């Protein structure tokens, strides 16, 4: 008559590493070095600097919007998973949001590694179809008359949102302006606030 099992993930993860490193395959310090990069160099502070510069420099803003790779290359912030950059501009009538519905594709060197919520099945499934409801649940209310545009990162372009400069930031220096540009403003789910 006709009538998955896994070791703990930490034991599987360390096993994979120990199998490679044993075989002379992982360079000395290689994994540790990447951990440092991911932690220290790939940062949303870089994206915030590019946004505070665009907000105060119209010519740099136009360069960022026409050739985003060239504008990031001026700072030397290009890198793995951030080699072809396109910045997308929010206007009074348009709110842009980025997702990788197929996995997690994110402009690492300038936004930092994707947060867990961005990689969730919930965000990947819902934001392409009901971005106004998803952003509302996360705490960002977008008025009915503003178009929402979702950029689904499906190939090699890596995106960063250029949000609107808030009213009330007149005479603010670039340092002051960088401070209100969060990781979530750069993904497109938060609006920068004063």
């Amino acid at each position: 008559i006709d009538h998955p099992a896994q070791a703990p993930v930490s034991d599987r993860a360390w096993a994979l590493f120990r199998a490679l490193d044993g075989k002379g395959l992982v360079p000395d310090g290689y994994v540790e070095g990447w951990k440092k990069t991911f932690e220290e160099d790939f940062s949303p502070r870089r994206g915030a600097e590019l946004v505070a510069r665009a907000w105060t420099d119209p010519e740099f803003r136009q360069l960022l919007l026409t050739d985003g790779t060239a504008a990031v290359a001026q700072y030397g912030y290009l890198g793995p998973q951030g080699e072809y950059i396109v910045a997308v501009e929010d206007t009074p009538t348009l709110k842009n949001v980025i997702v990788c519905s197929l996995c997690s594709c994110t402009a690492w060197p300038i936004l930092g590694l994707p947060p867990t919520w961005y990689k969730s099945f919930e965000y990947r499934a819902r934001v392409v179809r009901e971005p106004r409801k998803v952003l509302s649940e996360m705490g960002t209310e977008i008025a009915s008359d503003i178009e929402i545009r979702v950029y689904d990162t499906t190939a090699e372009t890596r995106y960063m949102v250029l949000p609107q400069r808030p009213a009330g930031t007149e005479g603010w220096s670039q340092e002051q302006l960088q401070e209100i540009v969060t990781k979530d403003c750069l993904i497109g789910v938060a609006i920068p606030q004063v």
Binding site: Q6, L25, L102, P131, T140
Partner: protein, 211 residues
């Protein structure tokens, strides 16, 4: 591949686990989490054993319930481990001995992939294109919600990359193609069951045709 990973448009999921600007804490919340991206780069860049596209596809080859129940960083531990074994660098046995337990891998590929189209069309910004209504069992960077649909090109890349459907299977006929940002009206993609305005998808030239 029309797998469970192609989630955009799926209904029944609850809230995204985040309020805007909540403190996310460190990059890595568990001590092994940095290993899958590090070892993937060791394979891509140090060993030249597989491409990044092969890492996207092997995660899509995880059995569907196993994909759905596995957290993000663990899917890449299983993904990278499967490619080491498939590439003959490691064996499943030695992983299980070192893990002191079962290490199930992704399922074998059911497709050999497809070459880059030999003859294609260069499109221009502002032109109306259709996403080819085609079904591909191996790796493809076309989410199913835009298959057969109509949009307007807003950007053509100045750079060119190997065709995913060929390089995600390690084939030698991947060529290189630009991709196009194709803007779709939300109602073109989900009728009246959407509250958004437009969706832009970055599609390889080979996925597109005029009109």
């Amino acid at each position: 591949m029309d797998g469970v990973h192609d989630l955009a448009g799926v209904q029944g999921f609850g809230k995204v686990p985040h309020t805007v600007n909540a403190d996310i804490g460190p990059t890595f919340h568990a001590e092994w989490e940095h290993l899958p991206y590090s070892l993937m780069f060791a394979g891509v860049a140090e060993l030249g054993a597989f491409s990044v596209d092969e890492v996207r596809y092997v995660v899509e080859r995880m059995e569907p319930r196993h994909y759905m129940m596995t957290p993000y960083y663990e899917r890449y531990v299983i993904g990278v481990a499967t490619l080491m074994v498939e590439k003959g660098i490691l064996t499943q046995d030695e992983l299980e001995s070192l893990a002191g337990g079962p290490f199930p891998l992704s399922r074998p590929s059911e497709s050999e992939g497809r070459p880059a189209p030999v003859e294609t069309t260069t499109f221009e910004v502002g032109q109306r294109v259709r996403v080819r209504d085609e079904y591909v069992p191996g790796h493809i960077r076309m989410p199913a919600y835009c298959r057969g649909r109509v949009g307007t090109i807003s950007h053509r890349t100045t750079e060119k990359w190997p065709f995913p459907d060929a390089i995600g299977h390690g084939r030698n006929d991947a060529g290189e193609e630009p991709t196009y940002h194709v803007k779709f009206a939300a109602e073109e993609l989900f009728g009246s069951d959407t509250d958004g305005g437009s969706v832009v998808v970055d599609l390889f030239e080979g996925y597109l045709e005029p009109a």
